[PDB]
RNA sequence: UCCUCCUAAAGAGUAACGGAGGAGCACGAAGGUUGGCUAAUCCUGGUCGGACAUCAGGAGGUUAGUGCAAUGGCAUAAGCC
RNA sequence: CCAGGGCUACACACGUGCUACAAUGGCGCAUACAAAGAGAAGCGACCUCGCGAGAGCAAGCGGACCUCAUAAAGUGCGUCGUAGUCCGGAUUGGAGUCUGCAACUCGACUCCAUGAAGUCGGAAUCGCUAGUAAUCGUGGAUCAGAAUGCCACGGUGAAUAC
RNA sequence: GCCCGGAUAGCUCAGUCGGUAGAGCAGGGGAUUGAAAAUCCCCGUGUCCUUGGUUCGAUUCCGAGUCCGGGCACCA
């Protein structure tokens, strides 16, 4: 909840000035991080989902939901139903603590960082981004690795603009280029 | 949050090598040995380095002089 | 046991193991034990951190992973955009500092290709 | 290479043209056979037509290219492939 | 031998060696009840990942889906757990 | 007659050889035993500097005198502990040295990194009967500089031939 | 005019229950041979006749079309 109290205490202030906004309100919110694992590899293997499914639960302390196909896909070889991905949703006190890790330790880590893209706001608000690598959470023990499946994390906000959006993530002091 | 589906969540410290102490919740167990935080990376600081650097006329000025 | 961003073998001794990195080799990991006053018969586990802290410091000196394929990337496309003899054949896949390309040419052109 | 303390290598013949060239303002392709001589700094923005075994293979200098030979941009050994 | 549309002339029905297609099954759950939910498609952004697997939003509003061929219906859903 | 380029190209196929694929080994330190040859537009001590190719002053030698020139493999003490490995050095980038008016197409070598393919090789085939084969270095001609080639020298040193 | 069958590598055939096409001949290095044969080793070659549809998906299933092979066109 620290992030939470360091936004509650100022980032508001910032985001108001500097929107010439008139009530709170209209200042944007984080409302979730949703983190993504698409192992599209569970068809030779059922246990290399079940794995990936313990590595992303090593990260945020959820119990991934196992997503399945939508529909059927000949170019891919699946049909519907085949579970092919991992999904974790994080709103509120973990979502707060995760985003704090993350910023604080995972980032630097990441090999040859030179910074994350500010074009990835979908338009809406929302920021998208993908990691090549998980072992940068420190929740892995190099010697225990099985394979190397990264993730892609987006984070769901009520801002309405992708200059609201860097806005809010530049008074998080988020990594921008 | 379900009971006992979830793994354990607890607090912990993580110590990092230039001094930025800090205390956060996960699911390690032992206490974080930490390389590079968020105060020590040459990004956050601001203090990242380039390639060009001039170019080719520095470089034959300096080592060819009539 | 993680330096420049990378992952170290323990049961190695400080030179074999520094060999690792992308940019350090045996004078350059001779270098930095010296500096740091680390023996060579010790691997890389049986340290404490302010001896693996010193290293790090001691190796930011060098260019390393994150700028070393940079620079070599930067100066491969601009032998390439200037169109210099030796961008023209990094272009077409062959030997640049002049060798033959009648025989024995394989390790530019790849694995034997009949017609 | 050249030996460091000899230092870079170039014809009169050459030299003179470009240094006439500088002042002169004669931006009209140049023509040389002297392709192992380096290239000067003062040589930038001019074009010059190098001498490549058959005709002369005109160059324009950048500021890029000071180091390297001159003869490096000039194909000597028509190739397209078999 | 049985089922859908047209010919079939706005009630039903109505023929030809007429024009177009199907059936001789399946399910102890694919039935009953209760509780809850709404897509096809396209756009934008994101690691392997490509026109299309998975994830976030936005547009769209049944243009999807019905265990099967067609017709008539289905949002209180007859569709989805 | 002169300048430049080419004789060193390249989807390929062939021969002759080098490095290797590793512990009968690689790497680090220490330490013995040779033979035969060249040197005046030459060999180039000692000393200083550069980690290193090499740069400077400058002796000696037309040579059983001086230089090339420390022989290596070998032995002792340690490490790696069977992995694409501290094997393999190809290729590539940067910084350099030497000769040569002039090292881009094309010389040789040094340093910092990069560390491919290869884990004993199919049909088939080659050389060898003794200081031979195998293995390890050295010198010389060519040459301003440029050999894994050629010509000679020695060190360790086999198995087998009914 | 009617009906049946087939269309697959350069040639001759096999195959397929919807997802992944093989065999022989032939061709290309190579080996042996003075050189060709013969033999041996190393190889890779298809949009499965065209078109339109059910399907996540068709060389496979269905409806039409082209070519070829075959069987009939009888009682007057
Ligand atoms: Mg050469
Ligand atoms: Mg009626
Ligand atoms: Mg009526
Ligand atoms: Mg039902
Ligand atoms: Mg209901
Ligand atoms: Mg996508
Ligand atoms: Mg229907
Ligand atoms: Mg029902
Ligand atoms: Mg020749
Ligand atoms: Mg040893
Ligand atoms: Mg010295
Ligand atoms: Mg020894
Ligand atoms: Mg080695
Ligand atoms: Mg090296
Ligand atoms: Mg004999
Ligand atoms: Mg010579
Ligand atoms: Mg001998
Ligand atoms: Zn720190």
New binding site residues.
Partial sequence: AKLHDYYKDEVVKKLMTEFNYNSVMQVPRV??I?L????????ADKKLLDNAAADLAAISGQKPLI?????????????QG?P??C?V?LRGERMWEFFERLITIAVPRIRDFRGL?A??????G?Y?????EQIIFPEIDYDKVDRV????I?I?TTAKSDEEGRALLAAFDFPFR | MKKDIHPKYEEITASCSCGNVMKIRSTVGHDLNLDVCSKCHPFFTGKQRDVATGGRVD?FNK?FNI | ARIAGINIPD???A??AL?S?????????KAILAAAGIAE?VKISELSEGQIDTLRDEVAKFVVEGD?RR??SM??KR?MDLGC??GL??R?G??????????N?R???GP???? | ??????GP?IDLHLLKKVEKAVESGDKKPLRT????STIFPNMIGLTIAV????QHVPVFVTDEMV?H?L??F?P??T?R??
Wanted: proline letters at 2%.
């Fill in positions: 409302e979730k949703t993504n694992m698409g192992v599209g590899e569970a068809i997503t399945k196909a939508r529909k059927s896909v000949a170019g891919f070889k699946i049909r085949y092919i991905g999904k949703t893209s074009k990835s706001f979908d338009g809406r929302n998208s981004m993908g990691v090549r499946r990264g993730l892609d987006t769901t | 470089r080592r | 049961h190695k001794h030179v074999i060999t990195i992308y940019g350090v080799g045996k004078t350059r990991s018969d070393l620079e070599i100066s491969i032998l003899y030796r054949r990094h077409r062959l030997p640049v500092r002049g060798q033959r390309t009648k025989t040419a390790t530019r052109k034997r290709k009949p017609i | 290479p050249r030996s460091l303390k000899k290598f056979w002297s392709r192992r001498h490549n075994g058959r180091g030979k003869g490096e000039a000597t050994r190739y492939g078999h």
